[PDB]
Design a protein around this ligand. Structure first.
Ligand code: A1I00
Ligand code: A1I00
Ligand code: CA
Ligand code: CA
Ligand code: CA
Ligand code: CA
Ligand code: CA
Ligand code: CA
Ligand code: CL
Ligand code: CL
Lengths: 236, 5, 236, 5
């Protein structure tokens, strides 16, 4: 552990500075160090962890998509042979992306999920597990693709089951989980009808619970509800 | 691409 | 050399792919490998080298400025002590930035400048040398700050002398060199009058030579002239 | 900040 000699509180402080400086690789390294201290994470600290890795992997995914498109065009009829370089570089980026996903999944497995007993923490981590398996699935083409997809599905499903039992329909973690599981259905599992049904049912059940909320909670929940609506508009 | 959080 | 086993042409190809994917750290590593093959660089290849490192160091400079501002605020009267972490992290980013600058200066010194005999190549590399010493100067606070500033000045001045003798006043490299040397005067050398005079004289001499240019050359030159004007507007 | 290229 490169961060083994730094205090937990200093790692957290520096993660916050790295976020302000848009240094997301540093932010992720600091938060990995904080997790490896072995203590549970607070709400704020869980969000630092997720933001850091979301931004790192988000950049890798965007780059992978650019390179994959170039590679696809190189393999069309009439395209002039340019050698192994496009495939090699796409593979380089892909391997880096898989490494980041494996790092996150490793933190969740050792030992964030097993120590998370409150619904808010457990659902948060299980959503992350689904998300990072989904990112692995986006680039998977081999013998294990089905198993990767099923790992994502299983994590999301456990998170959904807990969220429906333990959280109100407007809870932002519940809403974001459903948003992302809906995308999993549409983009990964070839299940657009399931995707649409989940987004609709989630939106409508949240709408019906908004009356219970403060102004500030209302703002939070309605922001995520609009993302559900945006996806529904894209898909219908 | 669709929205995720 | 991590890139020692990769063909020069493959490094160039991959630098271009990395640019398309906005993977500027990779782009810089590929171009470093290409330089270390020992052959001179073409116009296009010099521009790949400069773009890669400009983007890497640009990001570091932006982060350094964010962190330096936080550190300055932490040292004001009334500010609550938050420990060594802000300084430490600013120092981390600073050291990384200095490392990138030293890498670029190393490539120029071993052996790009000494093999560059055409005005266009030599001026290009000397401008880079001035720029990366300027970036070192931005973060310098010790015994060598004056010498760093003088190293930037000396490189820019040699580039200026060659450019005035060998290139027309509308040449984009000449114009960009003058733009950046003007900024050096304003921001580093505490010489705003020199900065303004250089930008004005450069703009006016270019204006008078535009009549000689094709439509495409005119477009290029006028874009850079507008940057000179923008700086003049900021400073007057 | 001022423009550079
Ligand atoms: C303690 C905890 O985890 N709380 C929490 C609450 C809200 C969010 C949140 N709020 C918004 C609003 C708009 C868009 C996104 N978000 C998120 N992000 C988010 C995350 C990171 C995970 C699950 C759901 C979710 F909405 C985050 C954390
Ligand atoms: C062979 C060679 O180096 N040619 C060359 C020509 C033009 C530029 C160029 N053109 C523009 C237009 C707008 C803004 C910036 N630029 C640049 N960039 C640039 C660089 C990288 C270095 C010196 C001057 C300069 F204008 C680049 C290279
Ligand atoms: Ca401790
Ligand atoms: Ca692969
Ligand atoms: Ca616990
Ligand atoms: Ca060779
Ligand atoms: Ca220092
Ligand atoms: Ca030569
Ligand atoms: Cl590669
Ligand atoms: Cl640090």
């Amino acid at each position: 552990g490169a961060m083994g000699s730094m205090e937990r509180a200093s790692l957290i402080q520096k993660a916050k500075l790295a976020e302000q400086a848009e240094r997301y690789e540093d932010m992720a390294a600091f938060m990995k160090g904080a997790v490896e201290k072995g203590e549970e994470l607070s709400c704020e600290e869980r969000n630092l962890l997720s933001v850091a890795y979301k931004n790192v992997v988000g950049g890798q995914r965007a780059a992978w998509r650019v390179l994959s498109s170039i590679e696809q065009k190189s393999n069309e009829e009439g395209s002039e042979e340019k050698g192994p370089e496009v495939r090699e570089y796409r593979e380089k980026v892909e391997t880096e992306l898989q490494g980041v996903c494996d790092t996150v999944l490793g933190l969740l497995d050792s030992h964030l999920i097993k120590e998370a007993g409150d619904a808010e923490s457990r659902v948060f981590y299980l959503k992350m597990k689904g998300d990072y398996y989904r990112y692995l699935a986006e680039v998977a083409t081999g013998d294990d693709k089905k198993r990767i997809i099923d790992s994502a599905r299983s994590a999301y499903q456990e998170a959904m089951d807990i969220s429906k039992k333990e959280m109100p329909p407007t809870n932002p973690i519940r809403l974001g989980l459903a948003l992302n599981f809906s995308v999993f259905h549409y983009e990964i599992a070839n299940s657009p009808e399931e995707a649409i049904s989940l987004a609709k049912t989630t939106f409508d059940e949240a709408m019906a619970d908004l009356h219970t909320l403060s102004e500030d909670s209302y703002k939070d929940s309605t922001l995520i509800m609009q993302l559900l609506r945006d996806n529904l508009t894209l898909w219908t | 691409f669709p929205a995720t959080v």
